[PDB]
Design a protein around this nucleic acid. Sequence first.
RNA 1: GUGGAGCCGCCGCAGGUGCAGAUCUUGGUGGUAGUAGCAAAUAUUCAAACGAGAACUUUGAAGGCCGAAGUGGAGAAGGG
RNA 2: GACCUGGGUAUAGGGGCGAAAGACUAAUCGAACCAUCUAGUAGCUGGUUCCCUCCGAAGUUUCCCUCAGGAUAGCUGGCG
RNA 3: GGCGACGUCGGCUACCCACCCGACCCGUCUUGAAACACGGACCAAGGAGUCUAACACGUGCGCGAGUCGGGGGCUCGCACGAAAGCCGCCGUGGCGCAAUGAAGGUGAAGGCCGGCGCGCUCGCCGGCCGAGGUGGGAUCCCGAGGCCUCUCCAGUCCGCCGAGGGGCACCACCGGCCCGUCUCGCCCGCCGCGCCGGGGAGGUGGAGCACGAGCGCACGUGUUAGGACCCGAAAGAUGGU
RNA 4: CGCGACCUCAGAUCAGACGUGGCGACCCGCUGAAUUUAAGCAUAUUAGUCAGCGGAGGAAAAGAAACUAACCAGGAUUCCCUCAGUAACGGCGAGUGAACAGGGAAGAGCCCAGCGCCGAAUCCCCGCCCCGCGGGGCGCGGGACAUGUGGCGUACGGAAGACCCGCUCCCCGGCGCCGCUCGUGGGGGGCCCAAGUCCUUCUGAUCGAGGCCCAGCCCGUGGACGGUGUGAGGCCGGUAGCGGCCCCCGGCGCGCGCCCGGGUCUUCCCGGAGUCGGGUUGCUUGGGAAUGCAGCCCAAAGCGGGUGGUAAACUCCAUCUAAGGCUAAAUACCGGCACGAGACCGAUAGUCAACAAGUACCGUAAGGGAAAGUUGAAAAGAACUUUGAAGAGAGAGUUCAAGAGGGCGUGAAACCGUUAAGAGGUAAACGGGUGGGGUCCGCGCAGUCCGCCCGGAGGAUUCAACCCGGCGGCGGGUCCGGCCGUGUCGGCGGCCCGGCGGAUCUUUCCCGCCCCCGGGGUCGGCGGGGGACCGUCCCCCGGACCGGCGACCGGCCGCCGC
Lengths: 260, 134, 205
Amino acid sequence: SELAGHQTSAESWGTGRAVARIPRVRGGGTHRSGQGAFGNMCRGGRMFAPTKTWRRWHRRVNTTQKRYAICSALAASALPALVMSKGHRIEEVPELPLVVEDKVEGYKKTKEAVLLLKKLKAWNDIKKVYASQRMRAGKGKMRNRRRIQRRGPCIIYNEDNGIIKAFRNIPGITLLNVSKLNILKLAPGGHVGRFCIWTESAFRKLDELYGTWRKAASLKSNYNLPMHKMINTDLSRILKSPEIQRALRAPRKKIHRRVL
Amino acid sequence: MKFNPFVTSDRSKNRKRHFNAPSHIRRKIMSSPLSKELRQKYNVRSMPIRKDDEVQVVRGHYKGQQIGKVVQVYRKKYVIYIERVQREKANGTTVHVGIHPSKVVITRLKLDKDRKKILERKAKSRQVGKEKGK
Amino acid sequence: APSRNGMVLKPHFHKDWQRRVATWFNQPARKIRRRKARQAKARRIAPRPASGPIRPIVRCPTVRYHTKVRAGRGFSLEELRVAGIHKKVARTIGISVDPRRRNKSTESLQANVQRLKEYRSKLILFPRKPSAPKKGDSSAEELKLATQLTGPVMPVRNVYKKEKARVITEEEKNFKAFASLRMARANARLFGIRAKRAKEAAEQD
RNA sequence: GUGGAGCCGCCGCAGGUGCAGAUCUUGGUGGUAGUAGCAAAUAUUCAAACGAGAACUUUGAAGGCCGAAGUGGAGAAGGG
RNA sequence: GACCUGGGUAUAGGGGCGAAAGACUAAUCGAACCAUCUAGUAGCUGGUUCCCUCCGAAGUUUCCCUCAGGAUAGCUGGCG
RNA sequence: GGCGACGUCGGCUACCCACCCGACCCGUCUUGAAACACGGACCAAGGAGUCUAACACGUGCGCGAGUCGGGGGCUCGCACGAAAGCCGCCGUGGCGCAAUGAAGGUGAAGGCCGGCGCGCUCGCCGGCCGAGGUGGGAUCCCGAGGCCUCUCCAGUCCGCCGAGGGGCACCACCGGCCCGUCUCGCCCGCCGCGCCGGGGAGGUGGAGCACGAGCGCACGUGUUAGGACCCGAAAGAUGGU
RNA sequence: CGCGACCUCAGAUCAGACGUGGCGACCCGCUGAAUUUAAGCAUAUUAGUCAGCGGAGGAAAAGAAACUAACCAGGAUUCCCUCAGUAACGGCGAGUGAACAGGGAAGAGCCCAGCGCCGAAUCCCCGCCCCGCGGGGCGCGGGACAUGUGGCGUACGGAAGACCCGCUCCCCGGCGCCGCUCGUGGGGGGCCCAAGUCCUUCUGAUCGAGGCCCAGCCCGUGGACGGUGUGAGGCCGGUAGCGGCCCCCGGCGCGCGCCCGGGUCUUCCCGGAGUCGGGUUGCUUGGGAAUGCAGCCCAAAGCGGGUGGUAAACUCCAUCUAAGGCUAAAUACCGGCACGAGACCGAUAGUCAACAAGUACCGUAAGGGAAAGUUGAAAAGAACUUUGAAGAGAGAGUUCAAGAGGGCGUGAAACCGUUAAGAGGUAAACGGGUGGGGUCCGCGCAGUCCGCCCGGAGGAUUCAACCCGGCGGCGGGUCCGGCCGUGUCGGCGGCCCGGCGGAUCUUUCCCGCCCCCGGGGUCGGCGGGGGACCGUCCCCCGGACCGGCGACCGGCCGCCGC
Ligand SMILES: [Mg+2]
Ligand SMILES: [Mg+2]
Ligand SMILES: [Mg+2]
Ligand SMILES: [Mg+2]
Ligand SMILES: [Mg+2]
């Protein structure tokens, strides 16, 4: 409520007649004769600190963090655990960077779409999207967003030649260009590891577009890929090495409970 | 999926067109599909219903194999009346109970100078779309 | 109301400011509006260049910025005269003309003239019909393209000296010192009083 | 047990986010209570009718009152 | 009779009008009413909505048109 | 080890009652409330520490002597796209890396050796280096000596190691250095010998140096300005009936 | 004394045109307070803002320097980013507070008076016809303007005129159209894919299940809405450089109208007055010894005048030409017509108004101003019979449901009625403590232990052991193939058919030039191109080391099902 909520003209009684000192409306006649005027307390009144249109809605993240997160989301679709346990059924599928040839971008009819995802054993995810054809919890149904629908995979591509015309009807699936990506699409709802189907011309461009650690990338053009904070991350292989257990004391497993 | 900006997606307005329609739009939303035997003869899918198109009622309380002609089309209540389906009052008087015409199958149409021309164009504007597969 | 160690503050909010607020909730919607005002103007005119005419070479006018070079407003009006082109065909050739501009040095004159005699050399015009009064053949066999972007001849190209490697000579590593700046200040602010005592020298007769 | 068409858990995000009070605000309901009250200017009574039903209506007979600066007969203004 | 009364007209807020009481000016007058600036300011009263667990005080110094308040230290907690 | 059903056995909930003991009515100001201090008939729903800017500090993340695209530009005529992506001869620019002064202006390195001009407290020269020293200072290194089925022959080791060395961060001090003034003082330099520049040694003033730590973003707390936690006047002003 | 001009002024229901009111969010001009802040209050703050008044527009205003600058000079206005919360102002308190640079959006410049020349070469009107739409043009004759100055050329970057030289002969409107149109200009109407197929549930399906080796069908069409409840396929519609139509939109091409530009030298012309400035007074601004603007007075000048941020005098230098005018764009929008969307509100919320809301109602008037959404899928709204004057009951009926009965979804709490159970002298209620009673709950009823192993008792099936066959897996292993890390280089291997980068290099390399006398001296280079060296990345063979989440080969041990 911007400012107007105060188009009711009134004043306080100003004396101790027997009512509260809240502003009361004027006149007579109708039922809005001596009722409560504006104030947050009263019926038909104004609200406490009526919200403004200049609340700071839009947020900045500096782009070295916008690129640190897009590297850490593509590097979480590689591991099978971070992409099965997000919820994608990638049980029966082959190799986790699924890579198909550049001939897939000639597809302009969606019968060729469905036989693609069936033959890669990845249709068993879209069949799970059809389980999410519910309707919205709460009161979204009158703010016109109704059918809750789980996302399926994404198809990540470049040099669009028809692939957007063939997959945009399949329910719950996404496309995104491999030059103009989206951390919203790669890591939906915060949980990392959305399942993805790649393309030869897209799976190769990332080495120019993010790089390796050996060189700077040639398309982000002043970037270098992030530096790994740990050398060996498998500490079960670390702490079972004889260079460590040469210097440890002992175990100490006697409990020594309380003696009466 | 809607791509046009110039057409809606909301519930607040599509209902508001749906109840506050004009009348010439109103016959368009009150159609009934053609029967299986007749959607091969004219190969057209749906026709705006009128006063003489005889009909069996398929989905509802009075279901199937009761071919009878329509008698009166309440456009105000989006409801047809058929002279076979009836329901008695408490008085013993008969009145027609009404049904929404998307739950209704035309077994046989009516033809005039207009319906020869409408069934021309509604059949013509299908196989033009078949010629886009070159 | 002031408390432990902090900042004295003067915020300018005592004036009523809740009426004169200007939200930028349309600053995307103006960018997609003024790209259409270019894209339906880049193709609307011609294979004449977008990004305006050829702009001059101009040096920035302060102690802070006189080491760099800026795109300016127009050829001053003797560059049109030195390069030998009439002043009211110059803006329909496609060269921008600034009428009131001075020039007082050849060191910044010639960088415009060298640009200007090179522009017309890298220019082709179209005939009405190919009678071609002062035009050669077909313009480069249909000119290889249509349009440029963001400046015809790249208006900055801020260029620098090399001075690759030298040898210290004797004088050079002796003289040009701190005392070559002090007395430059100690004379140029004492230039007038020392001539005032050189007015008193005459009346001693 | 009613109800008749939508709802919840979990990881995160965002709030016009939690009521005993403000002679709070709107709305509702008791206790008081079948209580206080229906007391300015004298006054009604009998029979008949219409009626499902009469102290209060009509009709009669009697008793009365205002009493010509009217508790009468007519207008202005206002009421429509 | 310096009498009472109907309608017409005139005089409007720091102004009308007064045989004078600060009376009267649409139940409002030691300054009318209506709307906005305005949600005007308040060292002043009234209120300030869930649970557990840990720690847990102060009414004194100095100065102020300060004595119903604030600053400063004191005392407290959280973070290390 | 013992006892026992077709109505019995256990068990309580926001259940009733009886009894004993305990028990003044709740919010609020207040040194003090059950108050003969105020508000409260009952019930439902509404109903009060918000948002924006600025700052400060703590924490979290990214990059790091740099960081930041917030503004424009680029991508096809895309619903979710008012998103996201990129620019870098788009770094202009902010804040930081450089302080002091009123201002003109000026603007942060000493150490060790040797040789010397009366080595004369003044001073001149080359060389090696290079952030000065004192006392504490976790940690790390050397570590005499000891410690295993018999005494002599040796190995990586381990554990207890007396003393000693290098010394992070920091804390106190002494010195140095930069800038502002003040006392004393002699010398040098020449785009040209002057009410010209430069320097010295002491003592003070400074938000300085002494191998830099900042910017961006997000969150919390606090303070201010905005109607500013909600409610409240007697007024005041314009413009009207 | 009449007559005739011309100047002043009037008259007309004369002929023909205009203007007046509405709106007001945005824009332009005036006028313009007080609350508040300062813990008081006068200056200051609030703010040159609300109110008041007058104007127009789809934008308006602003605008082509009487500018910023003080150096290697920038060059209309407007807008955005900074400069900046800085300079400055202020009981130097609270507070207020710009601009120039710089970067981008946008980019468009011109005319007139005058000065001087052209025989008024100019405009208006009336009438007739040239001849044409939906109307106006250039003809021709009348009348008026106008010499107190119309039109052409001209505008301060100069311009004219006289040459002289070498070029060149145009544009623009309408007219008819074809050929187009970037989302393929705009509007309008009208159409464009696929299951109601089997079984099942229901008041009703849009439910749950199902569909051969193509996964039942369509997908550029799984947005959405209504349908008797939850729909890609039942129907409107969505997608689509999908279609067919009807009108309108800019730009080929004949008849018209307009119609010598440029440079060089020589002469000539060259500018806005009760205004600038100055004084004094008020308002205002950051403008401070007066920024703006106004009143009043005195009132200019031509090498002049304005400005250059501390008043005055002198001198020097810079820059612009004021007192006349026009102008699209980038830009502001909370009223208007249409729209689209929403991490919103869900009927005491959202605007006051989801409904017959600025309505009912009040006030003499200015003005103040609410309440109030929901039966069902369908009215199928209770026919008919009984009682009563009727209200209202009882039956019957409709519906899955009247336990949905014409403010009818759900129907809470207070409260009241009634039934039952309980108890009742210190008003009731409460906390601790058991006891009594009642409701329901389980175990379940002297009828509950549950699995593990062993020994007896009878009962019915076939492994396992080994061995063969068998495909798979674990753990080693000559790492033989392949492998990849890091340093050593070499083939310079692709450098002259390599990647990016480099204020590393080269005045015998290649263009446009200055310095010096038709040339040259590198004689110093400058604007620019290669090719040499490094710095990092690409194969070869060669080396190391691990064959490591980098995997397979065979052979071995020891598992595993069939
Ligand atoms: Mg709910
Ligand atoms: Mg109490
Ligand atoms: Mg007043
Ligand atoms: Mg309500
Ligand atoms: Mg009840």
